[PDB]
């Protein structure tokens, strides 16, 4: 009966952002164990501390409370090891199992939270301020989750060429082809027609050396797969009375600090006003969250994911990643007096008419 | 000695947004005279009322006060006519001259305000919060000015095919070629080399009917010219040891509600982190404001102007305009309790680490 106490304790610390290189220079799981014992609790606490401070209207929903209880359990699940001592080749395996169990306990957090979004929509309505607060909270909540899962996957995978989930020689174009192949398969099964792929690389400094980077391939895959699914759906549906089916074109450009991936489709495009709503959790909920969450994966390592189409023609989706492992530093949301006032939105009659 | 009184009076009214169609359905300058007598004062007052409420540090600078005094004079310049009666074919020409004089009195507002930005930079420094407030204020101030100048140009031009500054049959591609030709001329004189132009139209609903729209051609020209100047400079400089000089490609797409213009160059591109700073008034000041202000012209009629490049390859600049004159409604900034708290930025340690 001390959960509120632990949260208040660890909620005083700030999560420690790690860089893609520090992750790579990994080497004693003892070193990791002692680190994760304090970091995971700090991260769980910060996200939990922010949740506890949102409207009781949102707190009281089975959804929020359900996951809120998962975190509480996960926090307690790791406490056990605070007084434990490594050296004991079984004290640290008790941990690896403890993590693999925590990870699975949280596997359905996205759908579960999405359910609360739908509950909110029908219970209180879908207005800008509601959208804003949810957007603000879900972006942070989810990003936070991504960072926690990263640490866990790094530990579990490392202590069962690649260092955990990180590929130091990630061939971007290869991940591009993979996500395409998978989307194509689905596209063919549902529409029995699918556009082709064209890839072009632009290695600025080294004209034809294949483009490689240090990155988490499964994160990149998730982003590309989501974008390919949308570009295919739109290309196919917008040419349902055309016989020609333009291909989806991808350019992978590597500059001094940016590694950019552009995906261009001729799927008809979308009006500027609807684009703004494609990344909204609330407006994109019914009666998925591929886009808003894919973006969080981009931002997690200081990158981004942006969209811009031409209604009547097509859409460009660009994923911006940092080219250097040095610049790829975890982007973590933290609980401060700063994050507190973003929930004090009392909007009613704006500054523009 | 009543300037403060007038401002407080008219500052109680909200400016009245007009649509591109109402501007087109114009027809008695008497009707205009009586309208502008109240609207101009209301608009001058709202922008003046917001200025008076910014740090005295900014208020006391010769720049701000200098323009602040221009508005005061312009406000008083129009008061005269409040009790005047039309019918008198000379009572309303006293007005047209009164406007043509007010317009010229304000011709150098941009450079003058820019001077205050530089003053600020060296006097107090260039930090995020300073940038934010200036950005917030200058965007509104300038937009406000654009709307005032619009009314004035509409009146003066109408009462000396086109209705004032509005072309009901604006051929976009033609304005594209014009701004290109002019930028090319300058580009040739300075670099003695200039890229070519390729234009492609995508009239979704009508495959090959030339793309026309109702718009203010000189506004569109200003935006395109700025973009062409940047795309030329970058293309030329990035290929200074190449002999090939890729062309600048423009696509004009017309959809059900959007009329989009994309300008693609292969000028090397810019790192994502510097893009964010290209639209900043503060960071783009030394020791011009083409971009940030071009964007305001786009937004003025509910459109937008966005940038996205690929470091190491090139940049796409897109101008989004509303396709329907019905949707082209003046976007006006207004003074409310809402606009007040955007200047209460007390940032110090954010929500992210
Ligand atoms: C934060 C401490 N670091 C630091 C930072 C700045 C200066 C000096 C030192 S560190 O580079 O020594 C470091 C890096 C990765 C991990 N851990 C891992 O790689 C994993 C796999 O255990 C996990 F899960 F944490 F990601 C651990 C335990 C420590
Ligand atoms: C705002 C009033 N309008 C309205 C709106 C909604 C419902 C009913 C009526 S209106 O359409 O009658 C109208 C439109 C343009 C102008 N003026 C002009 O076109 C100009 C040239 O005088 C100027 F400068 F104002 F732009 C004027 C005086 C009035």
XYZ file of C-alpha atoms and ligand atoms in Angstrom:
764
model
C 0.000 0.000 0.000
C 2.878 2.340 -0.819
C 2.492 2.827 -4.592
C 1.672 6.555 -4.131
C 4.888 6.863 -2.095
C 7.188 5.248 -4.634
C 5.733 7.357 -7.423
C 6.313 10.529 -5.387
C 9.874 9.396 -4.725
C 11.062 8.489 -8.215
C 8.927 11.287 -9.667
C 11.527 13.637 -8.208
C 14.210 12.349 -10.568
C 14.335 13.175 -14.270
C 14.709 10.399 -16.835
C 18.230 10.149 -18.267
C 18.333 10.531 -22.051
C 20.657 8.069 -23.741
C 22.213 8.477 -27.176
C 22.235 5.925 -29.929
C 25.991 5.682 -29.452
C 25.966 4.967 -25.719
C 23.444 2.195 -26.571
C 25.926 0.893 -29.121
C 28.893 0.822 -26.746
C 27.468 -2.179 -24.914
C 29.516 -5.606 -21.187
C 28.160 -6.643 -17.785
C 24.419 -6.885 -17.332
C 25.285 -6.118 -13.737
C 26.062 -2.613 -14.972
C 22.727 -2.607 -16.787
C 20.791 -4.154 -13.889
C 21.912 -1.502 -11.425
C 21.129 1.180 -14.005
C 17.693 -0.089 -15.051
C 16.723 -0.568 -11.381
C 16.667 3.208 -11.005
C 15.894 4.375 -14.557
C 12.816 2.240 -15.258
C 11.228 3.283 -11.938
C 12.003 6.939 -12.676
C 10.429 6.688 -16.143
C 7.387 4.729 -14.970
C 6.919 7.249 -12.160
C 7.115 10.329 -14.380
C 4.513 9.016 -16.812
C 2.353 7.780 -13.896
C 2.729 11.092 -12.064
C 1.420 12.963 -15.109
C -1.530 10.630 -15.552
C -2.666 11.083 -11.938
C -2.911 14.792 -12.724
C -5.482 14.764 -15.529
C -9.285 15.221 -15.144
C -10.898 12.622 -12.860
C -13.328 12.259 -15.743
C -10.521 10.620 -17.701
C -8.975 8.961 -14.645
C -12.188 7.124 -13.709
C -12.608 5.358 -17.072
C -11.865 1.596 -16.987
C -9.287 2.135 -19.739
C -7.056 4.695 -18.062
C -7.356 2.998 -14.677
C -6.691 -0.394 -16.265
C -3.335 0.693 -17.736
C -2.711 2.949 -14.749
C -2.860 -0.286 -12.732
C -0.476 -2.026 -15.113
C 2.167 0.615 -14.525
C 1.603 0.447 -10.767
C 2.212 -3.293 -10.947
C 5.248 -2.885 -13.184
C 6.709 -0.270 -10.835
C 6.250 -2.654 -7.878
C 7.530 -5.542 -10.002
C 10.919 -3.843 -10.222
C 11.096 -2.446 -6.686
C 11.947 -5.937 -5.406
C 15.460 -5.604 -6.836
C 16.298 -2.275 -5.165
C 17.945 -3.952 -2.170
C 19.046 -7.020 -4.131
C 22.719 -7.583 -4.873
C 24.166 -8.565 -8.250
C 27.113 -10.974 -8.156
C 24.376 -13.589 -7.699
C 24.067 -14.987 -11.231
C 20.408 -15.583 -10.395
C 19.621 -12.175 -8.902
C 19.934 -10.632 -12.362
C 18.110 -13.341 -14.318
C 15.201 -12.796 -11.925
C 15.314 -9.356 -13.510
C 15.424 -10.334 -17.193
C 12.331 -12.454 -16.574
C 10.828 -9.583 -14.601
C 11.224 -7.352 -17.679
C 9.975 -9.833 -20.278
C 6.880 -10.146 -18.081
C 6.412 -6.387 -17.669
C 6.726 -5.875 -21.425
C 3.980 -8.380 -22.189
C 1.780 -6.983 -19.437
C 1.813 -3.751 -21.470
C 1.472 -5.143 -25.009
C -2.064 -3.850 -25.511
C -1.627 -0.386 -24.032
C -2.271 1.345 -27.366
C -5.650 -0.257 -28.209
C -6.699 0.051 -24.545
C -5.900 3.753 -24.415
C -7.559 4.228 -27.830
C -10.721 2.782 -26.265
C -10.665 5.560 -23.695
C -10.406 8.072 -26.518
C -13.575 6.722 -28.092
C -15.220 6.686 -24.659
C -14.328 10.340 -24.253
C -15.663 11.296 -27.699
C -19.113 9.847 -26.948
C -19.118 10.838 -23.272
C -17.986 14.483 -23.532
C -17.701 15.292 -27.234
C -14.902 16.096 -29.672
C -13.913 19.774 -29.381
C -10.524 21.479 -30.051
C -9.571 21.769 -26.372
C -10.391 18.098 -25.749
C -8.410 17.174 -28.853
C -5.528 19.400 -27.749
C -5.223 17.949 -24.241
C -5.587 14.365 -25.436
C -3.071 15.036 -28.213
C -0.680 16.629 -25.737
C -1.041 13.755 -23.250
C -1.098 10.818 -25.647
C 1.981 12.074 -27.518
C 3.946 12.223 -24.250
C 2.447 9.029 -22.808
C 3.200 7.028 -25.927
C 6.686 8.504 -26.431
C 7.408 7.670 -22.791
C 6.236 4.091 -23.432
C 8.435 3.801 -26.519
C 11.505 4.841 -24.484
C 10.699 2.333 -21.727
C 10.208 -0.471 -24.218
C 13.521 0.489 -25.859
C 15.492 -0.025 -22.643
C 13.699 -3.290 -21.955
C 14.268 -4.654 -25.455
C 17.899 -3.626 -25.304
C 18.430 -5.504 -22.039
C 16.409 -8.648 -22.768
C 17.816 -9.006 -26.295
C 21.415 -8.318 -25.240
C 21.402 -10.840 -22.384
C 19.081 -13.537 -23.797
C 26.428 -7.639 -35.535
C 23.296 -6.238 -33.904
C 23.440 -4.703 -30.452
C 20.003 -5.391 -29.042
C 17.512 -3.828 -31.433
C 20.184 -1.563 -32.904
C 21.837 -2.246 -36.256
C 25.090 -0.266 -36.496
C 25.098 -0.874 -40.261
C 21.403 -0.437 -41.073
C 20.917 -0.384 -44.852
C 17.934 1.934 -45.168
C 16.962 0.947 -48.700
C 16.764 -2.645 -47.545
C 14.344 -1.779 -44.772
C 12.414 0.221 -47.368
C 12.038 -2.840 -49.617
C 10.994 -5.022 -46.668
C 8.124 -2.775 -45.508
C 7.075 -2.382 -49.130
C 7.017 -6.144 -49.757
C 4.808 -6.656 -46.711
C 2.397 -3.842 -47.553
C 2.272 -5.109 -51.145
C 1.313 -8.565 -49.983
C -1.597 -7.130 -48.003
C -2.504 -4.723 -50.769
C -2.638 -7.592 -53.272
C -4.834 -9.759 -51.030
C -7.366 -6.991 -50.494
C -7.378 -5.154 -53.834
C -5.710 -7.740 -56.067
C -3.662 -4.900 -57.542
C -0.741 -2.972 -56.097
C 1.610 -0.239 -57.317
C 5.302 -0.916 -57.852
C 8.289 0.576 -56.055
C 11.103 2.783 -57.241
C 13.915 3.692 -54.899
C 16.598 6.272 -55.430
C 19.513 7.065 -53.157
C 21.311 10.401 -52.876
C 24.507 9.958 -50.887
C 25.677 13.580 -50.963
C 29.249 13.145 -49.673
C 29.835 9.712 -51.241
C 28.119 9.548 -54.641
C 27.475 5.808 -54.749
C 28.354 4.170 -51.484
C 25.143 2.494 -50.265
C 23.423 4.508 -47.529
C 23.911 2.979 -44.075
C 23.214 4.417 -40.644
C 23.066 3.345 -37.025
C 19.389 2.897 -36.175
C 16.704 0.599 -34.729
C 15.519 -1.244 -37.862
C 12.179 -2.358 -36.457
C 11.307 1.274 -35.624
C 12.141 2.373 -39.164
C 10.159 -0.593 -40.541
C 7.066 0.369 -38.526
C 7.191 3.913 -39.912
C 7.749 2.840 -43.547
C 5.122 0.106 -43.386
C 2.483 2.560 -42.150
C 3.324 5.051 -44.876
C 3.378 2.337 -47.570
C -0.060 1.063 -46.462
C -1.584 4.531 -46.850
C 0.113 5.309 -50.137
C -1.042 1.971 -51.554
C -4.620 2.307 -50.387
C -4.832 5.803 -51.852
C -3.111 4.988 -55.145
C -5.337 1.960 -55.727
C -8.624 3.590 -54.767
C -7.986 6.844 -56.628
C -7.361 4.926 -59.898
C -10.254 2.443 -59.628
C -11.447 3.467 -63.090
C -8.045 4.023 -64.518
C -5.986 1.077 -65.756
C -2.676 2.809 -65.167
C -1.543 2.552 -61.551
C 1.407 4.923 -60.855
C 4.222 3.556 -58.689
C 5.181 4.704 -55.238
C 8.568 6.451 -55.365
C 10.996 6.623 -52.486
C 14.113 8.692 -52.182
C 16.653 8.098 -49.474
C 18.932 11.063 -49.094
C 21.922 11.259 -46.776
C 23.306 14.697 -45.923
C 25.830 15.928 -43.322
C 23.351 15.628 -40.464
C 20.032 14.492 -41.935
C 19.117 11.128 -43.392
C 15.788 11.734 -45.126
C 13.316 9.323 -46.638
C 10.644 10.655 -48.922
C 7.735 8.540 -50.113
C 5.759 10.039 -53.011
C 2.463 8.627 -54.228
C -0.053 9.807 -56.833
C -2.997 8.651 -54.745
C -5.153 11.696 -55.363
C -3.889 13.752 -52.466
C -5.713 15.193 -49.481
C -7.053 18.725 -48.776
C -4.714 20.692 -46.499
C -7.471 20.925 -43.876
C -7.713 17.146 -43.494
C -3.944 16.644 -43.239
C -3.861 18.479 -39.944
C -6.412 15.924 -38.696
C -4.571 12.805 -39.883
C -2.166 12.947 -36.926
C -4.895 13.592 -34.348
C -5.657 10.681 -32.018
C -9.179 11.903 -31.359
C -10.227 12.657 -34.933
C -8.582 9.465 -36.199
C -10.646 7.313 -33.825
C -13.899 5.471 -34.522
C -16.590 4.239 -34.730
C -5.825 3.371 -36.542
C -2.988 5.338 -34.929
C -0.332 4.376 -37.494
C 0.530 7.970 -38.369
C 0.592 9.803 -35.017
C 2.575 6.970 -33.454
C 4.900 6.487 -36.413
C 5.782 10.154 -35.930
C 6.568 9.571 -32.241
C 9.025 6.872 -33.302
C 10.704 9.427 -35.582
C 10.870 12.082 -32.857
C 12.137 9.600 -30.269
C 15.645 9.970 -31.725
C 15.323 13.640 -32.677
C 13.835 12.907 -36.094
C 10.402 13.746 -37.458
C 7.711 12.562 -39.895
C 5.832 15.069 -41.993
C 3.146 15.046 -44.648
C 2.318 17.327 -47.568
C 0.052 16.480 -50.456
C -1.447 18.204 -53.468
C -5.182 17.653 -53.522
C -5.936 16.167 -56.933
C -2.493 14.661 -57.482
C -0.652 12.932 -54.663
C 1.146 12.994 -51.333
C 4.727 13.187 -50.081
C 5.508 11.710 -46.669
C 8.959 12.403 -45.310
C 10.778 10.716 -42.462
C 13.659 12.779 -41.057
C 16.256 10.888 -39.022
C 19.572 12.096 -37.631
C 22.441 10.829 -39.771
C 24.902 10.658 -36.843
C 24.566 8.249 -33.905
C 25.948 11.155 -31.889
C 22.860 13.276 -32.618
C 20.416 10.406 -32.038
C 19.531 11.167 -28.435
C 16.376 9.857 -26.791
C 13.698 12.531 -26.756
C 11.996 12.076 -23.367
C 8.959 13.871 -21.947
C 9.414 14.977 -18.315
C 7.155 16.046 -15.451
C 7.769 19.647 -14.356
C 5.867 22.823 -13.506
C 6.242 23.395 -17.244
C 4.321 20.280 -18.291
C 1.668 21.123 -15.690
C 0.356 24.315 -17.324
C -0.185 22.678 -20.732
C -3.268 21.088 -19.166
C -4.648 24.442 -18.020
C -6.151 25.142 -21.452
C -9.229 27.286 -20.753
C -9.860 28.167 -24.407
C -13.066 30.060 -25.230
C -12.997 32.607 -28.077
C -9.576 32.818 -29.718
C -7.250 35.584 -30.887
C -8.336 35.376 -34.542
C -11.711 36.127 -36.126
C -4.941 64.848 -27.393
C -7.544 62.090 -27.614
C -5.664 59.334 -29.482
C -5.780 57.028 -26.407
C -9.558 57.574 -26.320
C -10.225 56.710 -29.946
C -8.102 53.584 -29.682
C -10.040 52.475 -26.591
C -13.284 53.127 -28.449
C -12.679 51.311 -31.728
C -10.647 48.669 -29.889
C -13.985 47.439 -28.562
C -15.125 46.384 -32.028
C -13.786 43.336 -33.851
C -12.534 43.643 -37.423
C -14.995 42.283 -39.993
C -13.525 39.513 -42.147
C -14.432 39.822 -45.808
C -14.405 37.009 -48.352
C -12.798 37.089 -51.745
C -16.290 36.931 -53.221
C -17.750 39.900 -51.350
C -14.669 41.823 -52.606
C -15.546 40.689 -56.114
C -19.184 41.779 -55.955
C -18.190 45.434 -56.160
C -21.015 50.041 -56.955
C -21.097 53.262 -54.928
C -17.934 54.382 -53.195
C -20.381 56.015 -50.825
C -21.145 52.490 -49.640
C -17.410 51.877 -49.335
C -16.673 55.245 -47.705
C -19.185 54.705 -44.920
C -17.845 51.178 -44.439
C -14.131 52.025 -44.443
C -14.768 54.942 -42.050
C -15.533 52.413 -39.327
C -13.521 49.367 -40.447
C -10.124 51.016 -40.955
C -10.325 52.689 -37.520
C -11.327 49.378 -35.926
C -8.397 47.571 -37.574
C -5.867 50.308 -36.814
C -7.097 50.365 -33.216
C -6.849 46.611 -32.674
C -3.271 46.441 -33.927
C -2.396 49.630 -31.988
C -4.090 48.320 -28.845
C -1.945 45.178 -28.959
C 1.263 47.119 -29.490
C 0.637 49.342 -26.453
C 0.551 46.136 -24.414
C 4.040 44.770 -25.076
C 7.166 45.342 -22.902
C 8.063 49.028 -22.482
C 11.518 47.834 -23.471
C 10.156 47.279 -26.969
C 7.759 50.230 -26.813
C 10.522 52.751 -26.047
C 12.645 51.930 -29.117
C 12.601 54.631 -31.840
C 11.407 51.991 -34.312
C 8.266 50.812 -32.554
C 7.370 54.326 -31.422
C 8.050 55.675 -34.914
C 5.520 53.332 -36.564
C 3.293 53.511 -33.497
C 3.118 57.239 -34.288
C 2.330 56.555 -37.934
C -0.722 54.534 -36.979
C -1.808 57.210 -34.503
C -1.624 59.745 -37.319
C -3.423 57.458 -39.753
C -6.180 56.811 -37.210
C -6.633 60.579 -36.725
C -6.354 61.100 -40.486
C -9.557 59.118 -40.971
C -11.476 60.366 -37.930
C -12.176 63.629 -39.778
C -14.731 61.842 -41.962
C -16.769 60.334 -39.107
C -19.225 63.241 -39.044
C -18.827 64.032 -42.743
C -21.665 63.327 -45.152
C -21.326 61.596 -48.521
C -23.560 62.924 -51.303
C -20.879 65.624 -51.549
C -18.845 64.402 -54.531
C -15.859 66.020 -52.826
C -16.393 64.618 -49.331
C -15.449 61.167 -50.615
C -12.524 62.203 -52.819
C -11.070 63.866 -49.720
C -11.084 60.276 -48.511
C -9.427 58.572 -51.493
C -6.586 61.075 -51.161
C -6.599 60.506 -47.410
C -6.013 56.783 -48.043
C -3.360 57.131 -50.745
C -1.508 59.332 -48.250
C -1.920 56.910 -45.337
C -0.672 54.026 -47.479
C 2.523 55.849 -48.411
C 3.047 56.996 -44.836
C 3.333 53.280 -44.008
C 5.398 52.054 -46.976
C 8.524 51.385 -44.924
C 6.901 49.721 -41.928
C 8.607 46.379 -42.599
C 12.240 47.594 -42.718
C 11.541 49.941 -39.782
C 10.136 47.158 -37.627
C 12.993 44.865 -38.732
C 15.372 47.499 -37.341
C 13.736 47.120 -33.949
C 14.287 43.380 -34.180
C 18.005 43.895 -34.680
C 17.993 46.449 -31.855
C 16.396 43.865 -29.600
C 18.895 41.140 -30.550
C 21.880 43.296 -29.544
C 20.132 44.966 -26.604
C 18.610 41.913 -24.873
C 19.810 38.850 -26.775
C 18.239 36.181 -28.973
C 16.601 33.488 -26.814
C 13.591 31.208 -27.577
C 11.115 33.231 -25.504
C 12.208 36.487 -27.160
C 11.948 34.799 -30.550
C 8.534 33.380 -29.648
C 7.006 36.687 -28.539
C 8.462 38.612 -31.468
C 7.311 35.869 -33.843
C 3.853 35.899 -32.287
C 3.600 39.703 -32.458
C 5.190 40.314 -35.846
C 3.048 37.633 -37.516
C -0.124 39.318 -36.227
C 1.137 42.873 -36.769
C 2.156 42.182 -40.344
C -0.971 40.161 -41.193
C -3.032 43.028 -39.779
C -1.098 45.451 -42.012
C -1.669 43.269 -45.071
C -5.445 43.300 -44.443
C -5.482 47.089 -44.016
C -3.491 47.615 -47.189
C -5.887 45.263 -49.009
C -8.928 47.401 -48.187
C -7.070 50.568 -49.120
C -5.833 49.190 -52.437
C -9.293 47.902 -53.233
C -10.843 51.326 -52.652
C -8.195 53.518 -54.291
C -7.863 51.236 -57.329
C -11.625 50.794 -57.769
C -12.406 54.522 -57.630
C -9.275 55.989 -59.274
C -11.757 42.704 -65.900
C -9.925 43.278 -62.621
C -11.803 44.376 -59.529
C -9.245 46.398 -57.621
C -6.280 44.116 -57.020
C -8.406 41.022 -57.606
C -8.312 39.051 -60.853
C -11.434 36.872 -61.109
C -9.717 34.861 -63.856
C -6.169 34.647 -62.489
C -4.123 32.224 -64.601
C -1.745 30.825 -62.002
C 0.806 29.414 -64.430
C 1.107 32.851 -65.970
C 1.909 34.442 -62.635
C 4.390 31.606 -62.118
C 6.219 32.459 -65.358
C 6.253 36.175 -64.495
C 7.909 35.771 -61.070
C 10.328 33.298 -62.620
C 11.300 35.672 -65.443
C 12.036 38.421 -62.929
C 14.047 36.213 -60.579
C 15.922 34.823 -63.592
C 16.870 38.296 -64.712
C 18.348 39.035 -61.289
C 19.926 35.611 -61.051
C 21.617 36.115 -64.428
C 22.974 39.556 -63.501
C 24.507 38.303 -60.270
C 25.637 34.770 -61.148
C 25.567 34.930 -64.946
C 23.895 31.518 -64.892
C 20.352 30.535 -63.988
C 18.320 27.317 -63.975
C 15.396 26.828 -66.338
C 11.718 26.385 -65.528
C 9.353 23.496 -66.036
C 5.697 23.869 -65.192
C 3.103 21.156 -64.992
C -0.596 21.552 -64.311
C -2.887 18.965 -62.730
C -6.497 20.037 -63.153
C -8.128 17.115 -61.338
C -11.773 17.659 -62.354
C -11.024 19.065 -65.826
C -8.013 17.263 -67.315
C -6.749 20.062 -69.547
C -8.648 23.249 -68.960
C -6.038 25.837 -67.914
C -6.038 26.436 -64.152
C -7.692 29.734 -63.208
C -8.798 31.035 -59.830
C -10.038 34.215 -58.210
C -7.067 35.735 -56.391
C -4.913 38.839 -55.836
C -2.196 38.357 -58.483
C 0.352 40.673 -56.899
C 0.138 38.690 -53.633
C 0.731 35.424 -55.480
C 3.592 37.054 -57.424
C 5.301 38.196 -54.210
C 5.172 34.656 -52.813
C 6.427 32.977 -56.020
C 9.158 35.553 -56.575
C 10.541 35.007 -53.067
C 10.537 31.245 -53.502
C 12.117 31.477 -56.976
C 14.907 33.734 -55.639
C 15.825 31.188 -52.962
C 15.600 28.174 -55.232
C 17.810 29.909 -57.799
C 20.420 31.043 -55.313
C 20.634 27.545 -53.852
C 20.666 25.698 -57.178
C 23.412 27.935 -58.560
C 25.629 27.929 -55.484
C 25.302 24.204 -54.794
C 26.486 23.375 -58.353
C 29.363 25.883 -58.563
C 31.731 23.072 -59.539
C 29.236 21.142 -61.529
C 28.452 22.150 -65.110
C 24.967 20.685 -65.036
C 22.452 23.040 -63.437
C 19.129 21.236 -62.723
C 15.940 23.171 -63.475
C 13.407 24.412 -60.987
C 10.159 22.455 -61.381
C 6.739 23.789 -60.519
C 3.488 21.922 -60.318
C 0.176 23.690 -60.110
C -2.520 21.358 -58.917
C -6.200 22.209 -58.629
C -8.387 19.992 -56.448
C -11.955 20.346 -55.108
C -10.936 22.862 -52.456
C -7.166 23.314 -52.688
C -5.147 25.001 -55.399
C -1.556 23.998 -54.653
C 1.701 25.215 -56.107
C 4.821 23.204 -55.512
C 8.276 24.489 -56.384
C 11.015 21.833 -56.363
C 14.702 22.650 -56.626
C 17.848 20.514 -56.398
C 19.759 23.239 -54.585
C 21.408 20.963 -52.055
C 18.687 21.120 -49.449
C 18.770 22.322 -45.864
C 19.044 20.410 -42.541
C 15.652 20.042 -40.843
C 16.927 22.060 -37.870
C 17.630 25.137 -39.996
C 14.268 25.023 -41.785
C 12.460 25.807 -38.569
C 14.626 28.947 -38.362
C 14.044 30.153 -41.930
C 10.617 31.563 -41.029
C 11.816 33.243 -37.826
C 11.993 37.043 -37.947
C 14.618 37.182 -35.224
C 16.953 34.473 -36.508
C 16.592 35.716 -40.090
C 17.773 39.209 -39.128
C 21.273 40.675 -39.366
C 23.961 41.912 -39.143
C 15.351 39.508 -45.469
C 11.803 38.620 -44.399
C 10.719 37.195 -47.768
C 9.710 33.824 -46.337
C 7.896 34.651 -43.077
C 5.957 37.417 -44.805
C 5.253 35.439 -47.966
C 3.629 32.898 -45.649
C 1.447 35.601 -44.067
C 0.193 36.474 -47.549
C -0.755 32.810 -48.023
C -2.534 32.603 -44.662
C -4.340 35.904 -45.214
C -6.886 34.074 -47.389
C -6.827 30.802 -45.447
C -3.912 29.368 -47.416
C -0.428 28.453 -46.243
C 3.208 28.200 -47.378
C 5.341 25.306 -46.240
C 8.868 24.054 -46.756
C 10.462 20.609 -46.731
C 13.859 19.740 -48.110
C 16.184 16.761 -48.218
C 19.612 17.777 -47.005
C 22.004 16.777 -49.777
C 19.449 16.933 -52.583
C 16.905 19.729 -52.747
C 13.870 21.548 -51.403
C 10.125 21.604 -52.037
C 8.220 24.786 -51.210
C 4.459 24.565 -51.394
C 1.914 27.354 -51.502
C -1.600 26.252 -50.518
C -4.449 28.526 -51.602
C -8.194 27.970 -51.371
C -9.597 27.011 -54.766
C -13.007 28.624 -54.111
C -13.556 32.376 -53.708
C -16.150 31.311 -51.147
C -13.468 29.805 -48.890
C -11.055 32.722 -49.351
C -11.952 34.668 -46.226
C -9.637 37.253 -44.701
C -7.741 35.768 -41.781
C -7.612 38.610 -39.234
C -5.842 38.739 -35.870
C -7.998 40.217 -33.080
C -7.412 41.690 -29.625
C -9.051 39.644 -26.855
C -8.280 38.185 -23.432
C -7.104 35.258 -25.551
C -4.413 37.204 -27.412
C -3.326 38.739 -24.099
C -2.013 35.545 -22.469
C 0.215 34.620 -25.430
C 2.549 37.349 -24.166
C 2.699 35.863 -20.668
C 5.385 33.366 -21.704
C 7.441 32.774 -18.544
C 9.420 29.847 -19.976
C 12.286 28.468 -17.874
C 13.009 24.719 -18.015
C 10.647 22.900 -20.372
C 8.610 19.695 -20.295
C 11.180 17.650 -22.243
C 14.722 16.645 -21.289
C 23.536 6.638 -18.696
C 24.971 6.190 -18.320
N 25.964 6.313 -19.434
C 26.693 7.563 -19.398
C 26.123 8.757 -19.938
C 26.874 9.962 -19.943
C 28.195 9.986 -19.418
C 28.764 8.805 -18.880
C 28.020 7.601 -18.871
S 26.706 4.877 -20.178
O 27.117 5.307 -21.495
O 27.708 4.431 -19.249
C 25.475 3.606 -20.364
C 24.935 3.375 -21.642
C 23.970 2.375 -21.821
C 23.524 1.577 -20.720
N 22.580 0.585 -20.847
C 22.161 -0.076 -21.963
O 22.677 -0.025 -23.087
C 20.898 -0.943 -21.675
C 20.785 -2.002 -22.789
O 21.029 -1.594 -20.416
C 19.618 -0.048 -21.539
F 18.551 -0.804 -21.286
F 19.759 0.842 -20.564
F 19.405 0.604 -22.664
C 24.081 1.809 -19.412
C 23.687 0.984 -18.208
C 25.057 2.834 -19.250
C -18.905 43.674 -44.835
C -20.261 44.002 -45.510
N -20.683 43.011 -46.551
C -21.561 41.988 -46.027
C -21.030 40.853 -45.338
C -21.902 39.831 -44.877
C -23.302 39.929 -45.102
C -23.834 41.051 -45.782
C -22.970 42.074 -46.244
S -20.772 43.456 -48.272
O -20.644 42.208 -48.989
O -21.982 44.219 -48.415
C -19.381 44.485 -48.689
C -18.313 43.914 -49.404
C -17.209 44.702 -49.754
C -17.148 46.086 -49.397
N -16.086 46.897 -49.718
C -15.121 46.728 -50.665
O -15.104 45.868 -51.554
C -13.975 47.775 -50.508
C -13.213 47.847 -51.846
O -14.520 49.053 -50.205
C -13.054 47.424 -49.289
F -12.087 48.332 -49.166
F -13.753 47.381 -48.160
F -12.495 46.246 -49.472
C -18.245 46.672 -48.669
C -18.271 48.136 -48.288
C -19.357 45.854 -48.319
